[model samples]
Target: LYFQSFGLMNEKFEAANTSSVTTNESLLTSLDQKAAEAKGEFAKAAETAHKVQAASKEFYDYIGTLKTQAVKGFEVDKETGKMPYEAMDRGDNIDDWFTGDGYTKKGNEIIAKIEKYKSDIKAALGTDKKYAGIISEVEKKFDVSDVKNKEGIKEKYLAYHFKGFPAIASAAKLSAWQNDVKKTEADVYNSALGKAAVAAASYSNYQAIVVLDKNAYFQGEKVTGKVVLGRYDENTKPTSFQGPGQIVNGQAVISLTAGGVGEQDINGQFTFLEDGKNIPLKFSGKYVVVPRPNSATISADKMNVVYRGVVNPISVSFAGVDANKIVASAPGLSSAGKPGKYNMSPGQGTEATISVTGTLPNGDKVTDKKTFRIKGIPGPTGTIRGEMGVVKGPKSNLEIATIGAKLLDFDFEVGLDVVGFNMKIAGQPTVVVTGNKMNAQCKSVLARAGKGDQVTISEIKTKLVGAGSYLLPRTAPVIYEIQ
Candidate 1:
């Protein structure tokens, strides 16, 4: 009975070792494939896979060596040609080498190796805090702390578990350790891949599309539109939508009343169920609103004017004609890469003539021309804390304030960068500053100004951003009153 039982245990251990080795090999292959698709998150996942492979393989082989030592002295049965595990019941084979009189020498070496294995895994998974829970679970499973003997006395883990144990049983335990190492490898590999999968499903991975019922809408008219996913999926509807819109079949439907005769924004988010969790996708778009016209005429209602040294946005189209069939041109004017859209960069001249020609599908052509007044950019307004004209504040506030310039009531949105300015405090000599900020000399003079004194910030110098080689008129001065 003892012979059969020992042989069966030995056979069981061999089968388990083969199965674990096969499982680990398959897992390593899959991990390599996952690492090849490296992107933002894939790069880190690959490093983790490499670490797990090295640590698990090293520690598994170490345990295999110990298992071989356990069965070293056993002789094979000559008749049956098999390991005589039944007669290998003596515990002296491994007890002395593995335990070393209660956790000394060889026993400590095994413990140290297990400790290193745990730390290697911990380091491999340190990139993301999401793996903290799994790290704790792994530590608990491979714990090598002291265990209590059957006599209720605390003892070293090796002595308590393996000392005086049958040689066959000790070999089985060593085989079990290898299987644990394989299980740890599998868990971490799956987790690393799962994290990469989640990052792959971010907003940047998808496309946004804007759909409008019409190109233009009248003022105060009801504008109906939809912001859809570019890769449309009619069956994958959104669970919720946040913004001035509602979701219908996974698209955001917006119904807004046009407020003014200009462009407006259509912004919202779509929330869809992904892996039982709601993932939100935000999108933005624009719509144009215009007033209904009573008469058909080609006109530049903004006084037929264009500013020099500035790129002016102009829209040109022929009445009752397709935009592609009409062409408009003038000196320094170019198409803005869209139908009926153009940019006017007026050059030196008091006036410019814009010629428009439209060809009908029947080969008949119509031509017209209009002259526009070319004007220099208007002078900017000097400012303190972005406030123009007169500003009232404490003397301390003026000391740290930066001078700036802005074009007031200008047709085009022009930005002016203040290069320098002059500071005058009541009776102090004017301080010429070469930058927008007040210098040490200017701050010293301003300190002498009494209450109710008028401090003038004058002769503000500026340059237009993105505009080249055009001189601007003097910018108006700003006055500061001490409070």
Candidate 2:
């Protein structure tokens, strides 16, 4: 009866194990199918979203072009009788006062179309939430209601049409400006989507992004009689135990005898004395006597010793002027002509003298003279050059020039930073000014120039004064090489 009961229990155990295995297999299969479905959904969503974003950008870009033409028309000057737009080669025959009725009607119609398309695309891509936010942002860009009112529009129109004729003549110029603003908005949207997509994709399977610094230093110091080498983590705890051990300098003599003497005797018989003896004694012929030594021989051992030293805490900090930021802040000056004596007008012509006086990073007042020669307005392809230097600093006046101009400048009064020379063509912000530091190749032509008259400036150079603190390792020059 006992054997029969045991056999029945074993059978039951086997059945339970089989059932568990079956359930686990079913669960794994379901998980794999769900994973595949999720992947498909993500891919479809990314593709559709990208398309919708592109469509919206295109619509906005079209609206920007229309607005540019309208603004340019209003900028027409009645006095010159010659619209500057003619110089840009857009069209010479512009009616002085069409009230821009035709241009306005066309612009509004196109704007309405773009708005509709933008809304539809947003809904289709399920991005209505983001789209709505952007739309609301437009209200904050400027007081559109002010410009929309008839009175305000008429005032602005007259001011530009009668006063700033040069600005109105160049339709291309106006278009370029509008495109710049729109492009900035597009970039922001693209950046947001890119960040979101990255987050979603990494949600399930992501590792922390760790930036490993190649120049990190491990400190070695002498502590007591030991040399301690350590690399610390964020918590100030040693991550590596390469520390405290025996330290020895070069060999040196160490005496064991007190006062470098063993003993001293003044008499014939050897004796230890703390002071001088009174007299000397002679030995008798019949008596046998032995002399005692005063000192014993000693030997010293020599061994190789390592001189232990510690590495100081190395801190990397930026202390010098950011040349790029400084250049960007300088105000844009017009290229009228050379300065005339007694003329209060700022120096005229592309070649002008800009005085840059400021304090260096070391709290020393520095005066600088900058001579800038503006390259002609960039044509289809061209480059700009400028020169700058410090008339006074730690090492005295220093000069350095490059083919490109400073991109940013610093303001002392308001403690504000501004970007100076921005080169754009076809309404697109070109490569950042610093981008040409090593490579000065022209990539495109300005839309302002005529066909076959594309201007190209090569070997553009720039000079920067406030980059002394960016010293290289071992005080070497930071060289940039292009292959």
Candidate 3:
């Protein structure tokens, strides 16, 4: 189907099953983000619901209990610990309330069960709060965008000072809405899970539902998982949740048996089984399934190569895995602010191999790697010991690692460093790199020259280097003088 990303396009050459990422992973990642959004919205709605506490209690004590009284005489099951609804017909009695207009099999089941253990349910009304999560935590993070989502939560709709809203009088309805919120979140993640298969498929573009435990696979290693996709929506309850591909009745199960490195399509191999017949899975675009440590990689925010004081920002998270968990390295790494994030440098003999791994439902690991080679020491930034704009011969020294966040070795980026800088003192052609320091013995230069003498240290400069490309930002000319 080719509706061109909006408003149903004309159908084209058939087949499709795909979803998220800068690749599918991005799309998958975005969906989970929406899932997160859904939860926060429900929580906010819960707060608005709290305003009408007395009314919420009134609803349960009246409406909730009224329905409960109808099934109060039914026997419960001891074996399965379930509500015994079938037994309601065993005797010669049907409560007049049970014979009311809206009586239903499922409805009867709910009432009896709620009635049996409603003591705790009724107790919630007397307490200051009625939610499992605290209101304080929710208050900090309960803003949702959708108007329907905003309905019960916004203070404007329900005047807490004077309640007239339907949702407020009945916490039951609000609770049910919370369930709807949760289900929507679950579906979004489920759909993200379903997209994993697409990222690893042999072909980049195809039509078929490709759900995987993770994004990539190894040749001899078994790659497998199940996922269902929709025409253009999510694997959640449909706007019309009544039929196939709908949240109420959608069935999506996909599996993969690892194959040799190359191109392949999931359409001919997998299909959506609906109503006794197999519906072929269709997909658009190509995909890559490779040998581990190949092209497979987590999204990296840093350059492949690094300097002495550079940072490594790479992340990969999807299908129930943490970004940090999916990220790691054997490069003698360091962390900041959070776990799974690392800072690296490439000088003083630095060669690093970073490994990023993702997990499948069965606990199988899919790992990829990116290799880095430290060509040389990183540069530095700013002047060293040149305080108050004064540069003395003996005390004025060029800082080795002043540019980027200092790493153990050099790793500095965007400035000059003692590692790659060639000292150029105007009158002293003898200045040299000694112990990562620059000085021309200070013998003829004198510790603190005459008041009118000119003491200047030129900006450290370097051409294209490996990891520390911008280490010293062209050196802000440290041309200071003796005062």
Candidate 4:
């Protein structure tokens, strides 16, 4: 059963890697495309991708080399020169190679290589701050610290796990190690793309909808469409709503009379009071007005749609159909435990199609699908005293300021916490801080700066509030000009 166990583990490892590799490759392709379109941070993330790929491939190959030696002179198939299942019962294979008086040369080399691999991966990730979790995870996985054995005695990791293992067992364990390295590589790749996407566009919970007076219109007559942004509660009412809509219960209620057929444009802006300040978000969309019949039956505004890595609450239903009779399906779309309500968690694609099938009154089945363009959360901007861009402030204020980040003009209300940042004062050495508040080192540098000096804060690291250790893209720096 030992061989069977080994084979099962190998199969599991292979199966997981198969799907993860495909997902990772797709994520990389999207990253490369985004990198090409933008410069600065995007370019830097793409470069990190290359470094991580190279580092992992090297580490994986080294593990393969060790595996070859790990199973040498054990049971083998004479025809293929490969180790067979029956040849895994011997204990001498691992004990002879990995353990001596203390440890053999090969055994020592394995520990050294594992340590080196950890350092290399760390270096490749650099000080992006967002990769802190990845580094911590990799370290834990490959840790060689002493482990307690069955006898309650502490033993070195290698000796405890592989000192006297059977040939097939030892070989299979090495393969498992290699698989871990691949998993790490895949995670890093996913993170690289995910972080970049966060800064590319700001998409929160709101979805744009085109409000038309009527679906059908007479040809050559005016066709009126009202574009409005949806999603708000009574407590989140807009201070001022611009467009053809009236604000009621914090939601935009729009109505327009039909005019000409063909197509009509719907555009508007929403201003809301957030933290005692007014923030405006603009929305624009278009819809078709047909000549009677059913030419303009459904109009899903093809504006900014679903965002990746976050839950998007949407309502899906067919007109004149019962909720229980209609079903909707998509890659990451699922019912949000209510009739006609859904939550979209788009993954690994530029667009997602939500297909709906419903039963009509006459026992007829109607099917329809809507494709939404997937967007990434917009990159955040660094803040000093909760202000973005260049801020004119006194040195005292700058010294006591709390560093922060914000997704400016983003519709979704995403909470962000500043974890770390790099601060640079005019003619002063750079200082790094671990938390959101200013440390003594940073305060001292700010005190030395004179009037009209520009203190720039860059490489700002952020984490989503309540998102565990999930990393966000580096925020654009905030330059504080001492007044």
Candidate 5:
């Protein structure tokens, strides 16, 4: 019985050993399959890396070419028909071949090459379904639809990296690297493109359209139609005349006798008639009469003369009523007159004390003690007020950031209608770098070279930075009619 039991145990142990061997073989096969998969993945990654390297080199070369051409274009001189190097170093007035048409053609050719390379890359890598999907995903993230050239593509790539890649092995590290590279590239590209854009927008044909509506008057006591008045030209000469007429609304009758007098009519004359006597008038009205017509005669039944002229000086005054009485009656204009006696005229350097008061846009009364000079016209002051529109372009953020970084030193070109003003950056630039961390900087720059107080880059609306300051207008609000 003991011998039989030993044999049975040996058989049982042999069956168990066989089962263990089969399990080991299956495990080895599974490990081999995993190893093969890993090898294939490595190969594919190596191939992709090689392609990326080659493409990056081509992209870099294209960028280098573009930079060279831009530099060449900027250094060329058109007036002397010479290159800067030739004139300065070679002492020759030879035209620069790298500028004008040559530079444009070369840039276009390089751009075409970049496009072809991109197409080739897409065709080569697109054959692999997995890689094609990866490319599609990356494209979606970057949204490079508007990328026209190598520079645009480079910016898109940098943006993608900064945004973070889901499939990248070490996504965090890669994204950080991408942000740095993108910032650097953006800085360079923005600096160049911004300068070019400003130059292009600045080359404007300016013809100042100064539309002025002017009225002039004289200073005196109650005078009737018997008083004939003379209008004085810019050189204090009597160029035109007005016959004495009934005082219109308690004011002496005065007409804008001098119309559209050009610079050529500098010393023209106008004479005033008091009763039947001619009074020699000596006052100047600088009519920068444009080459256009002084008055357009539109005749239907009666001739309507549309007279357009520059703001000029003319003298005419209301009856010099008692100052205290006038102030009590017409409180607004009485501010220009003295308390007890009425002055004939109220203007700069005028001894006649008359009080003139006006209301501001906010219903606030502005009063002046001395006589207010009506150099142009006695009217309310004009102002410019509005919101700045968005500045659109590739690398707009970086370009703006760079400007903000050096706000004070930067220069800008401003325009109003046909008139343009080139202003230097006075203060600082406002910058906002958005992302996980709200990293941004802001500053102000003044238009010191302009005609007003200062031009400012008021607000920079972005995810990172909040509201900025305000940009005051250089002139009054401009009105235009679209054709």
Candidate 6:
């Protein structure tokens, strides 16, 4: 339809319009191809920039970390005043390195010098043709190419420059930054300072983890363990601990054993051990053991109680399944820890659990306790009656007649001196009078009849001197017959 209107047959439009559209499309295609080509070139440029920045990054980190090294030295520092940390650097005055006001001053100086190189990089790129060809290509691709057009070239160039700045900047003075960093690295390496750098760079970040079956330990149970050292040194790890002796077939082994039981300590440091960097090998720890005896028993050789308030010594014998492994305790009785004489003072409650504990050298403990006791005297049971002054035949009296020196002496306390009896007669109730026997020569009215006559003596009692007193008492009377 457009062709009909345009052509009139004279200027018809189908093929012609299609031809113009095709031509315009080809131009746009050309523009797109160029843009894509430009994008590729930019990618390559970015790669180059990245390489330069990569170089800068490498040098920067290496130099930056120098402050942390140990072969310390120092140089002047206008910014660093006295913070007062001193060490031997590559520049220690007294040491092999040169000296400075402070080791920090040396670090600050190195950083300052190395960092200053970055400024040189900026100026270096400004006057150099490092990326000029790419810059020109970006210019040619400008939105408008007519130099006289309205503020176009400068704006486009400025945009392009800003767009490519980082990569361009990185590539701009890449060599200059590297030049000094490599130089410094080389200097430190070649001179004694090189030794300082290695000493400085050689730091430890390695560690080990110990794995065990269970933290619970037991005696007589053999255990195994391994210590794996995490490697942080890329240049060289401790190929072996110290020498060939440490490595048999290129395998570096660290032996950490769960040896012994109960509160174990593994102390170490993780840096330079000796000529090799010491990762200190000291570990602080506590190891416990399940070492208790399951069964036990106790016995005595022969226990004897002489008298009350007396020290009765008895030997104690002990045995058990783990008796050999057990240690005996002081039998609740011992004289200065001499294990024998016990206090057999009358009473119970003086009881103690005689215990013997089983153990391991590491102080593992297991215990068994038993009870002990002793008794009082064993003698003289109940009551008894005796004849007074009946010398011939005990049943009947000899008839004291009250004539002889044997008079009435009775009402006495148990176990008293008969000269000597602590007792009460009819005249002295509280006062005890005793001479030959406890009860003697009963007074009688001659029974008023001769043969077969009997006299009654009532209320007879005597007390024994003991805890039980062993007193004998009779409410009934005794009949005395005159023969």
Q: Score each candidate by Cα lDDT.
A: 0.76, 0.32, 0.39, 0.76, 0.31, 0.35
Candidate closest to the true structure, highest TM-score: 1
Error of 5 at 245 (Å): 99
* Alpha carbon deviation, residue 226, candidate 4 (Å): 16
For residues 1-483, what per-residue lDDT tens digits would candidate 5 score against the true structure? 133333344334434434543543453343333223322223334344345435534654554443343233335456843233222222011122124323235434543554654554465454554345434533443342333345544333222222222211122222332333233223222232333334323424122333233323234323323223322112121224434332332223444444554442224234543334666654343444434434343435431111111111122222322222222222122222334433122223312233445443234444544333222211111211222222222222312322111112212221212122122234544333232111222222221122222333322221111111222223222211111
Show the lowest summed lDDT stretch of 10 residues, model 2: 303-312
Task: For candidate 5, give the lDDT of residue 104.
Answer: 38
Cα-based TM-score, every candidate: 0.45, 0.23, 0.24, 0.39, 0.17, 0.23
Model 4 weakest 10-residue run by lDDT: 290-299
Cα lDDT of candidate 6 equals 0.35
Worst 10 residues of 1 by lDDT: 229-238
Model 3 per-residue lDDT tens digits across residues 304-417: 575454555544334445454465656556554565556665435656776777775456677877677664443333353533234544233232222111223553333333
The local lDDT score (0 to 100) that residue 3 gets in candidate 3 is 17
**lDDT score at residue 412, model 4, on the 0-100 scale:** 64
Predict model 2's lDDT versus the native: 0.32
What does the lDDT read for residue 117 in candidate 2? 54
Compose the digit string of candidate 4's lDDT tens values, residues 200-280.
Answer: 443453568887866765455578878876654333445578888887645677777765886787789888554346688
Q: Which stretches of candidate 3 lie over 4 Å from their true place?
A: 1-302, 309-327, 334-339, 345-351, 373-377, 381-453, 456-483
Where does model 4 exceed 4 Å of error? 15-23, 74-83, 95-101, 127-129, 202-483
Residue lDDT tens for model 2, 277-315: 323223211211223444453423331111111111111
Q: What's the CA RMSD for each of the models?
A: 31.0, 58.4, 35.2, 47.1, 52.4, 26.8
